[PDB]
Amino acid sequence: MSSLLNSLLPEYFKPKTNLNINSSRVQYGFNARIDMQYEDDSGTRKGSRPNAFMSNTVAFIGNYEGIIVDDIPILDGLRADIFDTHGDLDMGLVEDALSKSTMIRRNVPTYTAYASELLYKRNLTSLFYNMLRLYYIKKWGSIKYEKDAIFYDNGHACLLNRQLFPKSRDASLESSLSLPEAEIAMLDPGLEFPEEDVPAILWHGRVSSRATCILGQACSEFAPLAPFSIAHYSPQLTRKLFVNAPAGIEPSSGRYTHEDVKDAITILVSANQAYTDFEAAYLMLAQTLVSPVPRTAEASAWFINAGMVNMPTLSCANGYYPALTNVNPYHRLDTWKDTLNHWVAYPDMLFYHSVAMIESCYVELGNVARVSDSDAINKYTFTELSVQGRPVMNRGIIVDLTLVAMRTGREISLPYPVSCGLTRTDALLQGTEIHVPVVVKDIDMPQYYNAIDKDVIEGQETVIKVKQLPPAMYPIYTYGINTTEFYSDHFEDQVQVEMAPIDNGKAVFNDARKFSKFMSIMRMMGNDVTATDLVTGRKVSNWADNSSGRFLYTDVKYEGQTAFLVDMDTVKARDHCWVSIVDPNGTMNLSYKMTNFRAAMFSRNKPLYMTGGSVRTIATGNYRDAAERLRAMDETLRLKPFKITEKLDFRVAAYAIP
Amino acid sequence: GRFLYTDVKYEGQTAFLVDMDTVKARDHCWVSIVDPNGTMNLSYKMTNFR
């Protein structure tokens, strides 16, 4: 769904057609200008940060596994006459439709019996999913995965790719997969009984020598060596695949270019009228394509256990009964060919749509994790209250699109309630502390991180405990579309806090909200302050994340209640503007303004520049030549948003109906 | 049988950690706090005097 994911990008940013990705890691952000103004009891001070880079990091590494499941049928592309006055498939009219379009009327009773059983299981989403993955393996087939490389690196702790991904070796993306080929047989017209558990698809003219090899490899098993996002393990779709081609198919060549895969997809969709089936596969890949690099070491807990990708079962009966597919197809929405027309024009735009989607999900799960398990809307019952359709199960895409609705605060709508794709909320839905394996870089590691072994040596491999899941990403593209108090991602804001009395060289902050505001100010001024949690006896630091220049309360790494002892004597000066002061006095007022946003992308510690021309808009209106909006709002999936209502605690988040 | 704030025997900053799984029943004619969850609300009423 192009028009949906295209809306998530910020109004100032309009990306160009091509993007030459040449690495397994891409930073994306913006260069903003901050105009700070400070006032306290001592006096006033005015400064200005001329260039500030706020960015996340996203990679092409994510452990996933495929399962074949049975899902709903997509009834789009079938002729409009077989459907009655309502949006329902009548078997009374299928008998009539097949009868009028043949001379041999002996086969009508047999044809109707088989058609009735097959039409209620038609889904080509799994075939297009694999065909799309083959396109990007050939295009970006020079990305290197080194086993003894770094995953996260702060200075105290470190995670290697040996950990998080065991049973892996060093390989390029083209060298990862060695796909076998399934038998692409020809369906001779005259066969009366459709062979069971084998799909048949239509084709335009002669099946090319290259087109055979693509369809053969798309249906086969995926068995990777290196952990890659677009080369994840998938079960075998089918053994055989019939093709009702008037001209006979040619034998498989063995080799194909990425350009040849586009020609295979464009023909397969046009012949079968499977435009809505492609839209499902497009959204399903947008989830998987890229995975987040964690903000802090604790945010690696999300990516330990392998998330399951629900691939629908491959079934189709267009090859057997080509009478059912004619020139007047049935569609629910009039904008039902937009997603394919967008991809075929601008293939590399999927990267930006993928980054936009996975950001929105992992940002909002930062809030859902902090919700107490004694309210109406909680981690267990947030999807069920949101959805207003009838899917098979609240899994895959339904979970992800619910989180996008909660982020943007708008009603998202799909034509069919499809439940296919990655489920992320697995690490969240379990009342157990997660054991992230880490490497010790400095001797003073146990003071900061909640480590098992309290005495360590540089080189030792230990384990750290994570109870509450912290935010994996900060808002960048979705910055200021709706501002929560937790992130505090405002354009303009006036922070007011009262400074605690400095007894010896230490200031006690008993309250939780005041402590968050204090360290948030001192960070924007650019003062590396270090405080001691009195309950646990572990040191917290506002400079936890360098990439995103902000302080979240989850950097304390202790759910519950505590009091902090801030060290006011050892306040280091890392980055100093003219605003920056060391000695606060009385009531601290900081008023900042953010202006002059401009998007910038970094890859392999150099600037990554966009190539090609400017993207012209392709989009169809609500009506072509349709008079009355026959609402048909019974079967269509609808996802209602939730607004965060702030309360006194500040540690707990709460959702309400707007 | 009351607690005045001068029983702390020190004037400083206020950060009192109370662990509510080490509460022990001492006297007779007592209400039990076995395992609390959520917001607590304590209250009393003195009615007659002799």
UniProtKB/Swiss-Prot annotation, chain B:
Coiled-coil residue spans: none
Places the protein is found: Virion
Biological role: Capsid protein self-assembles to form an icosahedral capsid with a T=2 symmetry, about 40 nm in diameter, and consisting of 60 capsid proteins asymmetric dimers. The capsid encapsulates the genomic dsRNA and the polymerase and remains intact following cell entry to protect the dsRNA from degradation and to prevent unfavorable antiviral responses in the host cell during all the replication cycle of the virus. Nascent transcripts are transcribed within the structural confines of the virion and are extruded into the cytoplasm.
Assigned protein family: Belongs to the totivirus major capsid protein family.
Protein name stated in the entry: Major capsid protein
Gene: gag
Full-protein residues shown: 549 to 598 of 697
